[PDB]
Design a protein around this nucleic acid. Sequence first.
DNA 1: ATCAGAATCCCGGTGCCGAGGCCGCTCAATTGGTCGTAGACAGCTCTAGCACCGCTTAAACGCACGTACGCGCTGTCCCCCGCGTTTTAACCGCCAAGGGGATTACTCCCTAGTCTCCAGGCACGTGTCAGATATATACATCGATAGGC
DNA 2: GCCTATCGATGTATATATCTGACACGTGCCTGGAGACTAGGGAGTAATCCCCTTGGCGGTTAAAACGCGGGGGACAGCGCGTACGTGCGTTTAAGCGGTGCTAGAGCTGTCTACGACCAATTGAGCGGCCTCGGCACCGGGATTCTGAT
Lengths: 95, 93, 459, 105, 103, 78, 87, 97, 97
Amino acid sequence: KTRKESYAIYVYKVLKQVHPDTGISSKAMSIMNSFVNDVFERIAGEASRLAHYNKRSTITSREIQTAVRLLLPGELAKHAVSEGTKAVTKYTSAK
Amino acid sequence: TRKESYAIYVYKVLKQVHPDTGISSKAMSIMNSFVNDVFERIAGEASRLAHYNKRSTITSREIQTAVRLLLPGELAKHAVSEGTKAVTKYTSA
Amino acid sequence: TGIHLRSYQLEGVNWLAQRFHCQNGCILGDEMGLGKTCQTIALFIYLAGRLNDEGPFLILCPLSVLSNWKEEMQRFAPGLSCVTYAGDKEERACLQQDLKQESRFHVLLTTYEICLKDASFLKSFPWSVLVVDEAHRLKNQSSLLHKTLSEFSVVFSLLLTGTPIQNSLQELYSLLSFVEPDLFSKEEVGDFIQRYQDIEKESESASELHKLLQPFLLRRVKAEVATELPKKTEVVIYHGMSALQKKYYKAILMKDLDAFENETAKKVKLQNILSQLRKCVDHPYLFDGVEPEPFEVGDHLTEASGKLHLLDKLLAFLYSGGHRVLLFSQMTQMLDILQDYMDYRGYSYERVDGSVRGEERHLAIKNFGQQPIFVFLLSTRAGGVGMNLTAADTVIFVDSDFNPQNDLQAAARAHRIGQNKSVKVIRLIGRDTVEEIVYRKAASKLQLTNMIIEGGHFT
Amino acid sequence: AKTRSSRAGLQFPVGRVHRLLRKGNYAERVGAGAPVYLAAVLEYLTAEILELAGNAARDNKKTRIIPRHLQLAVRNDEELNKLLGRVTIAQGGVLPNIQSVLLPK
Amino acid sequence: TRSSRAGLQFPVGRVHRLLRKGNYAERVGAGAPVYLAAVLEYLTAEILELAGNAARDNKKTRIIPRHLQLAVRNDEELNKLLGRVTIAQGGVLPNIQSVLLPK
Amino acid sequence: NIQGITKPAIRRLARRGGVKRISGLIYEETRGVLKVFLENVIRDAVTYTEHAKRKTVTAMDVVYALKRQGRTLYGFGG
Amino acid sequence: KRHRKVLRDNIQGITKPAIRRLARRGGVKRISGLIYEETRGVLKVFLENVIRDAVTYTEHAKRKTVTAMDVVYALKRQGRTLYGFGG
Amino acid sequence: HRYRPGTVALREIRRYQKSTELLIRKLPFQRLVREIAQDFKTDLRFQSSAVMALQEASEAYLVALFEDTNLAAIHAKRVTIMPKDIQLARRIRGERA
Amino acid sequence: PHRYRPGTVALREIRRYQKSTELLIRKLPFQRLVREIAQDFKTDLRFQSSAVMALQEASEAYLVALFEDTNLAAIHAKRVTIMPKDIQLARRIRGER
DNA sequence: ATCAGAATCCCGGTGCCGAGGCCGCTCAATTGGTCGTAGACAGCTCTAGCACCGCTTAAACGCACGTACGCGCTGTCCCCCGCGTTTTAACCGCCAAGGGGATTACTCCCTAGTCTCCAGGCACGTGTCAGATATATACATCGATAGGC
DNA sequence: GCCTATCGATGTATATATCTGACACGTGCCTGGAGACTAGGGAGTAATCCCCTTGGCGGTTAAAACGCGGGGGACAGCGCGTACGTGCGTTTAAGCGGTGCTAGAGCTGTCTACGACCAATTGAGCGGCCTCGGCACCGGGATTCTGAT
């Protein structure tokens, strides 16, 4: 019978990271899940558009990084950017 | 070096509505960018429609409804009729 | 009739008269000034008063010379009604109604910017001829000047120079073709590049190339006319940069520090490093704010370039030796620095610059002449042409040029229509600098040119 | 005729449109009807636009269409104005307008 | 897992899968999904901070849409990011213009 | 049945919209504006319904319509 | 004296009459001069946002010139569209 | 006694700004939606959720435009909103036809 | 002597500037300002010529639109003179922040 | 002025259940090796972009003046708010069909990709005349004065 | 205090003139389009399950409605004098024609590091049923108010 995936457990665990004592509501989780999708939707559109404008078959980290700096104001962008490169560093240094 | 454009098609269409007229390169440039924009708008919506309706394949039905989702009604109705006429006589070939 | 002055005159006139009797334009490439004007005006009265061709003549010459050009007309040819089209748009408008609607002239005297704007009259009203000298804009086939002038209505025209070919063969076939393009258009269409294979036939048949030209161009050399045979000696001053500009030199090669932000050599643009390196060796205070205190006048100016460190003593020494000088600068701001040095010394100078009006230039000639003014401060482009600046015993190129033809033109402000003293010419060089490199590349252009291009009456 | 546009009786380049759609990534697959339908729509739109611009040009005594004429047409047809609301035309200017309050009396 | 290999809580493989299906390009290099996942996890946390604070301010532990809206309308870049965006039951910032107020 | 949008409902909304005082002419204008807005939304949602061969509208058609009309609402759908 | 020259900031180089000339094209009849500096500020914010994204396109292309398409993509990504400069 | 004019209006604003709940009677709104939709197509069924989503979006959409009208009146140095204010604001949004 | 009444010539100007379509800022200043702002984002960067003209089109067009909104704002205030707050209100009601 | 009292919070109590957890499982993410391509690298080309000068001037700037507009001020009045009132049907909890959605198995047509052939489309050079532009009208409309009446 | 003139002021429209560079046009050339071809599974059909929306029932209450006083804001009109539209003369530097340079955009060819691909493997995370105490929401308080003296 029917099945559907979510982001919910990740958000939930991230909540427990920031505020282990703190709870949430399904309504809020629904809002968060939609929000997560919309951000992904926005980034991917740019990443596609960038690759096309750069005659590129292949999206990679550059497209995400620059798309983020296009989509986000402020140090919020650069925090995210640095986490991205950091996470990519961990990934690339990991095996 | 070489690049495509719509210009010849626009030019011929101009000679339909206004034979014995011409067009500045500026206007033709403007027309091309405009045609590019319209193409982008429809195709992105056709993608979403197919995605929402799970189709791997863009189809004429997507095109029709995408145009309906963009044009003011009479323009859409005319456009739909024209696309219909073209497609039907094409496939009748 | 006009005057008899110099031996080469009548031979040149008879050559020119023959050329126009051959019913073609032609080129006279003799040395600078030399009264080619005079021989041309003799040709005009040969028309007006031996052929009785009083068809109205037209002349284009540079803004710097117009008044002296009138003077050359006034000295010997007031027998020709010579009228000048000049001044504010109103003045230009009136002269149309007053003269162009009236034909009350033998000669029309004009300059390039005006004649371009007012070309309609020069299309519409037939001249006997145009004449142009200093015509080196015609090196460039993209010049609207040539494109318009080649459309203007003339029977024939005379092309004059004493500084032919500033860079390359295209300039020659341009100059060549634009006089008689009805034949030579195929040349500028590039057939001549084939006919003489881009000069690559070179010394092995340079006579052949010049055989293409000697039927059509005359050139006679000043050293060949000899006559006054003054001295012209060139010398070159390889001297180092001062430590301040050396640091700026490193920074321009590398990075500016925030000290050079307070002096603001950063927060400024960088997309012509050559220009900045040149300024750096030339003088760092050419950069705004690089003068460490704008209120001062002092030795910091004189020291902040190793050039000025020498040139102060040199100027004082030369002036003390009674040697007066022309200083030619690549950039007006260095003339300002030189004038700041004059003001700092209280040394007394004249100046001519593109902003200076031709009447002001003319009086500046009478002011640097006639009195012991230490220096004439001259913009190379505006000031290089024509003048009889014999009052200077010396010339110094404070900053090196990119075409030695400019140096020749500037130096040939001596000796033209005579000079009667020893003249010394001095070239300043930043030792171990780009100035050496520019010098070497400039010398390469020289070496590329004369070794073939010297043909003419030379052949 | 070999030309598919001719079999469609269109002017617009079915083949090029089909290629563009194939390369457009808008979905993994494209059905043979989709290119034809879009081409006809674009051709119709272009004509409906150019006709009004051509009239404006003719009314300005000019046989050649220039950006002003496009802008006028696009702004005189408020449906084009809405459709191109987020769009600007270089050197198009604007429609004449004075709010009556500003008129002298 | 790739997620664990990146040290991320967000599902790198799922992100990669979504990129595959999303047709955004013919091809994707391995770094892209890694970097993108980190972005999403980061932005998720940053929001959840203010949401928890608003809940703490509201003396609640179950984060609720009111808190989310208030948070977004109190972080300008987020309010800008979500300017075209609205939140169910979120309401508005409580504020009134001084012209309206009693003396 | 547009009057089913009650005057006091409109006033309640305007109070959240920080309006201190409302001239009654506002109410009919409000109903007018809202009707046009709703209709344009309804249009596209039905279109997605038709295209999906559905007889039944979904909030997905709504959120898609909103997304096409320059709006988005997190919380419904997904 | 001549040793240096001081020059007005190009922001003010958006001249008073140029603003009026543009404002008149916007149908502005009558203007209080504070409009002028205010407009410059508005334009500066407007230009800044577009330029930053444009340069960002340029850098992702690793170009040293800003490319006109970078402006087009900047404008369009910022939700404004302008034909007649390519597309 | 009476509370003075516009005094309790502020408590009402504070209430409705502090609270976050829906402001419209569902059945009237649903009826309106349905008997509009019938003119787009016959017998359109609806997700129950869709009605609520529409109502939320509608209320939100009005709320912002209302506040824009408030500022418009305020700029006109008036405290009573008037229809001209809405028409200006909608057109300054560019969202009016 | 003679003088035109206030605004009379501006009306001719307004009509002239509604018919004409050329750019209105002096190009050279406009280029300089852009290149300064560019340096403020990126110490060194070149420009294609056409890019500058594209910017100026967008800039003047964007400004002209904002003028109309301000004009209507002042008119809505029953003022013929425009003042900066009308612009700020316009931007606010344009939703441009 | 102050005190009245109206209606706003703060508090403990009742209690409900959406939220939070655990289990069964499955399928997609992981691990693993292969194919072959993109696109990264390096190189060469020459464009168009950068820089200062020489020169014209349309333009900006600044000046002085008067206008009417913006403005603070006034009073008028009426339509709004706040309120008790009566009336209404939204509400909510309840019921129960059965339409429509969501579901799967079997299926062919359709398109992806194949290669072959080759001209529609293009980059390029062409001639030429439409809009360009000269400056001349015409007669506008805009004016003032300030007519008369 | 008009309202009609009046000249006439200075305007732009509309006049016919010659003029050019941009544009319709023809070229050789060629790759993407068209004419074939197959492969296979995406999309379609009929299929059932059951959920959901549909329509419906009831009673209780709150929301809507209506009647009202009025005072407060909306509004009109007035005087004040600011500052800004205008026409002036003066200056600047915009615009333009050059001058000259090369950095880097754009192309080229080479390759091989990278990812797509397919197979099998495993538990990740999903859904179903589970219990609970943070949540509402309750009654009844105290607080903290306006607003009349």
